Amino acid sequence: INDNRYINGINQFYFSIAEGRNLTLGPLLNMPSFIPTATTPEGCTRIPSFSLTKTHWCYTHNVILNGCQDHVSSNQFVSMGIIEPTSAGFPFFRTLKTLYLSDGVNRKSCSISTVPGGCMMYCFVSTQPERDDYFSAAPPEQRIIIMYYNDTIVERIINPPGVLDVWATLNPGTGSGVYYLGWVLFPIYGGVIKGTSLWNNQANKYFIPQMVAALCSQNQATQVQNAKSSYYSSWFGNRMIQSGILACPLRQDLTNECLVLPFSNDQVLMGAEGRLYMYGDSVYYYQRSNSWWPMTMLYKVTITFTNGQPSAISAQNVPTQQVPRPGTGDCSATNRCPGFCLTGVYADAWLLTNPSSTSTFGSEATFTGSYLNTATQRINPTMYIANNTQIISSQQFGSSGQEAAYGHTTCFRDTGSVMVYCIYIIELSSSLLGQFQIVPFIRQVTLS
């Protein structure tokens, strides 16, 4: 279990609105990395997922032997452990168990979540190029693996209702899932088939971030028209790209008890990878900006239960115009106008302040994470702290041109020294070993 110094400083808003204005990032601290490196120049480690809870943490990433492209073979590394203080005062992520799922099943886009006594992981089995998954009417096989600290492993092929003949494809969002009220929730996304109930119920819906108007040169009517069209992709089998949540009851005999809960397209942008968080008793969702709006998207999720089962989800966006991501064409970090786009990168963000603490939800929110500071290239990894309109502290890593990809950020507090630490898990392009080196950068978020 996690050390007493951390058991009470996890999954919370660590600072007050007033303190948020005076936060800065400290120097990077050196700790033994708990994320394994490749041992060949062409080895590829990508798509990490990290879940940290009161008792322990779970980590996982995908491994491909040659280069970063396969739809046949790949292995998935899973790791779990606890956090303990070092003599220097900062955290050490102690690995207590390691697993390497290597058996021929091509598990991809996996999201992992902490559960009492272990980790629950949700993956889908890839057997063809991503684009092909959208054209085929049949969805990929879905699997959830539960790995207990006692070394028992139970994997199940799941068939949640409302998937077959509704979703041409379904993928976990790769971002962490969360254990909530006896259920494990995972972010999901995919393509919905035209003519289905889901499609019809989503027809004509769209979402436009609160701060777009002042930055977009198009008129309201034009924005609305383009926003509505941004949820349909002709390149991806003419499917409605949808975001959502997969809720699974914690059982070892899962078959069709998990529930697919899609977000209303009136509250969320075009479906994309994502991540779920827990701040106290509130659930939050991070949605990758793979569409027209290039800024960080965070939402407070309200979950409704009907007869002990999740029946509906509602999302309220934290309005910002900060931390853009690199994109292609007319959808780069500089874009501000609605339209159809299918480009971007995963870059979640951690809320250091409570958006509900202001009279108007999210009027003054502070968050931290990493982002690729460029308009169209996945380059210049940069850790930062920002509010709705400005970056108030940042430090680029490496020299300009340094390639990087996804970035998963997680913060917790040492209730002993009373300082907040954040771990920025960044996929860095390496020139020595492997295509990428996923690094768990760690540093303090100083108040002052």
Ligand X SMILES: *[C@@H]1O[C@H](CO)[C@@H](O[C@@H]2O[C@H](CO)[C@@H](O)[C@H](O)[C@H]2NC(C)=O)[C@H](O)[C@H]1NC(C)=O
List interacting residues with a second copy (CB under 8 A).
3-9, 28-43, 45, 63, 65-66, 72-73, 75, 77, 81, 84, 86-89, 92, 94-100, 102-106, 125, 127, 398, 413-418, 428, 430-434, 437, 439-442
Q: In this structure, what token pair is assigned to residue 226? A: 């383009």
What distance, in Å, lies between the first and last C-alpha atoms of the chain?
32
Give helix then strand counts, H and E, for the chain. 4, 26
The amino acid at residue 394 is: S
CA distance 396 to 427: 14
Q: What are the E-state strand segments in 138-296?
A: 142-148, 153-158, 167-172, 178-180, 183-192, 232-233, 239-249, 259-262, 274-279, 282-287
**Given candidates 38, 112, 168, 423, which one binds Ca ion under the rule CB under 5 A?**
168
- Residue 372 is which amino acid? L
Q: Which of 4, 8, 22, 309 binds ligand NAG (CB under 6 A)?
A: 22
Query: Residue 136 corresponds to which amino acid?
Result: S
Of 136, 197, 255, 309, which lies in the binding site for Ca ion, with binding defined by CB under 5 A?
A: 136
- The site partner of 249 among Ca ion, ligand X, ligand NAG, none (C-beta below 5 to 8 Å per kind) is none
Nearer to a second copy, 7 or 337 (CB): 7
**Closest separation between CB of residue 314 and ligand NAG, Å?**
34
Choose among ligand NAG, ligand X, Ca ion, none what residue 213 binds, the Cβ cut-off being 5 to 8 Å by kind: none
Q: Candidates 17-25, 227-235, 259-267, 407-415: pick the segment binding ligand NAG (CB under 6 A).
A: 17-25
H/E stretch holding 202 reads helix 197-202
169 binds Ca ion (CB under 5 A): yes
Residues that bind ligand X (CB under 6 A): 117, 148, 150, 152, 364, 387-390, 392
User: Which does residue 202 touch among ligand X, ligand NAG, a second copy, none (CB within 5 to 8 A, set by kind)?
Assistant: none
Size of the site for ligand NAG (CB under 6 A): 3
What is the Cα–Cα distance from 318 to 220, expressed in whole angstroms?
21
In what side-by-side order are the strands of the sheet with 23-29?
Answer: 23-29, 436-447, 419-429, 404-414
Query: CB of residue 394 vs ligand X: minimum separation in angstroms?
Result: 12
- Residue number with CB closer to Ca ion (194 or 378): 194
Give 18 or 215: the residue with its C-beta nearer to ligand NAG: 18
Residues in the chain: 448
Q: Which of 19, 70, 155, 257 binds ligand NAG (CB under 6 A)?
A: 19
Binds 339: which of a second copy, ligand X, Ca ion, none (CB < 5-8 Å by kind):
none
298-to-96, 285, 347, 366, 414 alpha-carbon distances in Å: 32, 6, 11, 11, 25
Which of the ranges 18-26, 36-44, 281-289, 401-409 carries the binding residues for ligand NAG, by CB under 6 A? 18-26
Q: How many CB atoms lie within 10 A of CB 326?
A: 22
Asked if residue 257 binds ligand NAG (CB under 6 A), the reply is: no
Cβ distance 151 to 131 under 8 Å? no
User: Which residues does a gap of C–N over 2.5 Å follow in the chain?
Assistant: none
CB 205 within 8 A of CB 264: yes
Residue 201 binds what, of ligand X, Ca ion, a second copy, none (CB under 5 to 8 Å, by partner type)?
Answer: none
- Residues 74 to 133: which contact Ca ion by CB under 5 A? 133
Q: Smallest gap, in angstroms, from Cβ of residue 119 to ligand X?
A: 12
Q: Is 125 exposed, middle or buried (0-12, 13-18, 19+ CB in 10 A)?
A: middle
Residue 379, CA distances (Å) to 297, 342, 351, 399, 401 in order: 20, 19, 24, 10, 6
Position 364 contacts ligand NAG (CB under 6 A): no
The DSSP bridge partners found for residue 420 are 413, 445
By CB under 5 A, residue 345 contacts Ca ion = no
Which residue, 72 or 181, has its beta carbon nearer to ligand NAG?
A: 72
Given Ca ion, a second copy, ligand X, none, residue 158, with its beta carbon under 5 to 8 Å by kind, binds none
Residues lying near Ca ion in the complex (CB under 5 A) are found at 133, 136, 168-169
Residues lying near ligand NAG in the complex (CB under 6 A) are found at 18-19, 22
